[PDB]
RNA sequence: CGCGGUGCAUUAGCUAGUUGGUGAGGUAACGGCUCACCAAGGCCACGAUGCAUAGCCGACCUGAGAGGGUGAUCGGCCACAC
RNA sequence: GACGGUAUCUAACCAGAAAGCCACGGCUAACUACGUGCCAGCAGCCGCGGUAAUACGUAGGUGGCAAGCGUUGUCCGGAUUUAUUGGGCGUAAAGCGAGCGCAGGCGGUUUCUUAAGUCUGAUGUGAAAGCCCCCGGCUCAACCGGGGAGGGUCAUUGGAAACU
């Protein structure tokens, strides 16, 4: 668990969808918004808020994502190795990159990258365009994400030993 | 499938077709036979003229030329612009380009080609229209 | 029979000139059997680089120099070389 | 009827490590006893002892977890296969996860990590990659 | 000397005098999906006495064209 | 082509100020047109990434083609930050060299010196706005031209040299004695926005 | 002579100097290259044959790469000259 | 010395002769007025136009690029949309109605051996030009020149023996 508190978090908006519900009147119109609030340091949520206007759906998925904030591992200004991230119809394949190559990627993926703080890295997906699912799969890849001291230590050599 | 399967029966891609058929043929009056030449454009001479229906969504009175390319090919054609001088045995010259609209025309006559007159009064895309700097 | 001769090259009113052993039915800029050196003819002393070596042994194997190429060859002293290899 | 006991054997390794089981059997082989101990050396398993019986041998391979039960061996991957046997040249020898995870591989000088391969300037058959 | 190419077959016809039809039985790489697959080369080799037999192991050198299609000679039979 | 329209209004436009001083900005900073003055809705991604490549084109006065080969060479040096590497070759272009050396005030200026000829690298006349010069390679003025009124007020009037340009007054000749730094170039622009445009 | 590079099986049989042998002649030269005899062989689902299309390549365009497309100019080879 | 009084150099005079094209509803950077009224027309897709049109025409602005700009044509990409790299087949397209089986594909453990595959070294070659890397010449660049590297399911030959 990563408390929101002492982090500077700053929030962007990803997609702001109106939805429906059908009423016996006719059409109940409501915003969902999908936001992702991240550190610029390795710490990065999403949030999901839906309301009949656009900045109370905003707010509400601003505190969302602050509650379910992640950290990333990085090696510099790039993720530390390869790593594809599936959830639903979304698939992302994130890969480092060398320094000052900028951030290749698409879309929600974009915002995910910058908010988290990364500066380089290529990124492709495979799924859908979801933007929902294709943020999801972009944190289940960074999850995946391992740090060379924790493998280190896990496998019980040294991480010089390691590489 | 199966590597062998593979090997047994390699994979196949689809063909595409162009939208655009007639500027892709030659004709050799010779041996009298269509030849495969990719054109951008293509000559022809407007056998008939006038003004067709759009499809449901739409209501006006597109304007058309059918018209008979240098290849012997009869397409239907359309006239961007405001106004034309065109007639039946106008020659005209055909650029690719579909028109949502209507129903079969898949070729444009272009502007301030051949017998075709620039668009009167056009000022702004003035290339297109076929029209010179006033 | 095999000729050394100048094989043209460069940019247009800027010549530049390989030495090349070439069969003399062979196009000027075409098929040519070997490269032996260069020709740089817009230099105040004109520059020459040469393989001496292989030149003498495909003199020594019957090429026929062109006339500038001899002179070239003169120049670098390949062709005394030649001749007292002759002898 | 099986095609691949090398498969095999990894997929049973990524079974038992998906349930956390703590140990595992399988039938004992040449090329099997080279994978479970550069697994050991590599540190992704926590053991392995051999039972001799009279139908091939037996090979059990206890599990290595860390702190708070996470599972070392995040996943095996067969990459050799009979259907398509992959050879890698000295210079080819890949790397898993920029050397986090280690790639089985058997040359002339036999099964050995491609780390190791690349040291020899050796290529190779690619068995299997682990992370 | 130079050397012409030598290879290894099996007979799989003889009912012509002074003659052998083998096949080489090489394996060649899918060009798209590497594979081996098996690829069947047959030559037609003078025999001098007609001494091979249907299925037999031999080897062949390649020599001048002896007729139409011969190009190789028999060497050795090492199979029956 | 060469741009030659007002430099306020590119400058606004850009939000920043080209020139330095920041004239353009300090009156009626808003974006060209009748519809700037009004509030305007946020920009996109796309549109940041393209306002950064047009901030630097447009500091340097350069075309979109030659900005283009530019960066490529940029990113085939192999050592450092590939953002930082393009504007470290926009600084070495000849034009920048004159403007940093403060023989003309603007880059305008110094680049119709370099394409009148007035200015000489090593002694040798140079009309190429565009050439690209090197660390130690000396850039002066031509012995007729030393006495114009233009260069002489610029000269005297610049006060503040980047610490990599070396500069000699009365012989009016200059060099950079080392690569500038990404601090000593101008921090308002993102070099990483340009790399991922061009990216595209 | 080995190997490499188009489509179509809604194209499956093709071959009769054809396949091989013995001679003889012919060629710069091996050779059914040609001829007389002797046999009935040779090719083919690892695609024969047939149909359609096509000069081949170094190279060129694209692509992260795998690959996809092209075969101007330049050079090599080949073929052709109503 | 055809080029040719050609490149080039010097000196005098003058901001004076030398900027267009397309785009601005979203995709897409770029917005307002009139005129128009499912008409005239636009359009690559979504789709605009029925009297208050940022989507048509004009105007004023603005964006892109620039001696070019845009349209069409064709190829690649995006297209993982033939997926070897790199997809699938319960209900979205997709398991033959089922079995017996020739060829083919694949194949249990292990000792020894072989070296076809596999890995590796040396040699020869894969022309020149062109890509790419260094170094030079044209005031720069284009371009040109020099030296390299690369490029083969290559041939010969020497090694290794885990796997096939
Ligand atoms: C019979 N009275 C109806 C009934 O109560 C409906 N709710 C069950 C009620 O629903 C509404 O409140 C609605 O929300 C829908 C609207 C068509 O009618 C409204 O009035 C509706 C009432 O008129
Ligand atoms: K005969
Ligand atoms: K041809
Ligand atoms: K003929
Ligand atoms: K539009
Ligand atoms: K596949
Ligand atoms: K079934
Ligand atoms: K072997
Ligand atoms: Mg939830
Ligand atoms: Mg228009
Ligand atoms: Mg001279
Ligand atoms: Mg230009
Ligand atoms: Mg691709
Ligand atoms: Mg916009
Ligand atoms: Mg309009
Ligand atoms: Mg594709
Ligand atoms: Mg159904
Ligand atoms: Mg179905």
Redesign the interface.
Known sequence: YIDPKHLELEDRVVAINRVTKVVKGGRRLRFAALVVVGDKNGHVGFGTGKAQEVPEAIRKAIEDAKKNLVEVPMVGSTIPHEVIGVFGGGRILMKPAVEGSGVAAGGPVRAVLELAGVADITSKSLGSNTPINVVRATVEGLKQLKRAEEVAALRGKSVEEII | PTINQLVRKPRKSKVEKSDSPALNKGYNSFKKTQTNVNSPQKRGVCTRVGTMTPKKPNSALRKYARVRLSNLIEVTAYIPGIGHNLQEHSVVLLRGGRVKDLPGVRYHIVRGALDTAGVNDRKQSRSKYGTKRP | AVKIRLKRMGSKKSPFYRIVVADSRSPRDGRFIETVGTYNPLKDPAEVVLKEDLVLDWLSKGAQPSDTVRNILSKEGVMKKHHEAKN | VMTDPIADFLTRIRNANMVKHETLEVPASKIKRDIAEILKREGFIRDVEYIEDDKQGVIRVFLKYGKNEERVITNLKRISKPGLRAYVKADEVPKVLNGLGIAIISTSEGVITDKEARAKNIGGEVIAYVW | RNQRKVYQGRVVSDKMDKTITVVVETKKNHPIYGKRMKYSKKYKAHDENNTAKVGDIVKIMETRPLSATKRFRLLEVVEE | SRYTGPSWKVSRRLGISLSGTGKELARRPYKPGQHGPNSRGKVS?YGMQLTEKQKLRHMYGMNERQFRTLFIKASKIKE??????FMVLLEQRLDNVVYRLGLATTRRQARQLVNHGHITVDGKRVDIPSYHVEVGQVIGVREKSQNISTIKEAVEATVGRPAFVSFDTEKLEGSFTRLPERDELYPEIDE?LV??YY?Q
Not at chain 6, 80 to 85: M, P, R, Y
Request: proline residues 0%; glycine residues 18%.
């Open positions: 991604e450092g930050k590939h953002g930082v590497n990483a790399v991922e990216n």
